[PDB]
């Protein structure tokens, strides 16, 4: 969830979550915030200027939001 709010996407894959989970145990939650916000993806997409925003949305959320095939014209 904190990954979604800070980066705008869900996690690409299992390897990615493991790094965050691992940092969690050795260094703690403060360092968990520090690794997400000082990551290269956040620095490239958002930098020092832009408030984060929702960038990627999985297929369940788009069936959910009645987009594409699902939508009622009516």
């Amino acid at each position: 969830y904190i990954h979604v709010r800070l980066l705008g996407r869900p996690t690409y894959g299992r390897q990615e979550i493991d790094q965050y989970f691992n940092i969690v145990y050795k260094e703690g939650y403060y360092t968990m915030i520090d690794r997400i916000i000082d990551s290269r993806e956040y620095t490239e997409t958002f930098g020092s200027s832009i408030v984060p925003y929702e960038r990627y949305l999985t297929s369940n959320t788009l069936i959910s939001r009645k987009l594409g095939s699902n939508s009622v014209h009516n």
Binding site: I63, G68, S69, N70, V72, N74
Partner: protein, 160 residues
């Protein structure tokens, strides 16, 4: 399940109260609309076949789905497809005639999205087929009863 009557007795029962004038106004509303619901269910019972035929003809045929590779491409899949449209029309009629969509919660929409996402049934095409049944059915039963069927077809579509 429950109809509108059972739902009234549920709210009044779960408060512990008896039936006050609000609940009697709701029962009067249902008993005013009763006969309209009956004749609508009679007509849909008469012409279910033609509703499914016209709605498959509007929504599904001559596209990638019935072309090879699509999900309706074989005869087994075609027949399973129109079988499922028969369920949507029948349970939509039950929901109309009860005046309460709890039936659709119990016996259709529970686990159906997990089923179609398991099998590979496209949800979008299904929704468009249901809406085709909505337009054709409203054309058969008329304006008022078409609004009633419209809330239950829209209820199933909201589910998917």
């Amino acid at each position: 399940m429950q109809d509108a009557i059972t739902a009234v007795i549920n709210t009044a029962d779960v408060q512990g109260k008896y039936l006050d004038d609000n609940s009697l106004d709701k029962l009067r509303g249902y008993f005013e609309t009763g006969e309209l619901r009956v004749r609508a269910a009679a007509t849909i019972a008469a012409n279910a076949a033609t509703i499914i035929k016209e709605s498959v003809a509007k929504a599904l045929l001559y596209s990638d789905i019935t072309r090879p590779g699509g999900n309706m491409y074989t005869t087994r899949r075609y027949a399973a497809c129109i079988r499922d449209l028969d369920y949507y029309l029948r349970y939509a009629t039950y929901g109309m005639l009860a005046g309460d969509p709890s039936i659709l919660d119990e016996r259709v929409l529970n686990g159906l999205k997990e089923t179609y996402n398991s099998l590979g049934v496209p949800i979008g095409a299904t929704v468009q087929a249901i809406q085709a049944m909505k337009e054709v059915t409203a054309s058969l039963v008329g304006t008022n009863a078409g609004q009633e069927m419209a809330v239950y077809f829209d209820y199933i579509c909201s589910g998917l």
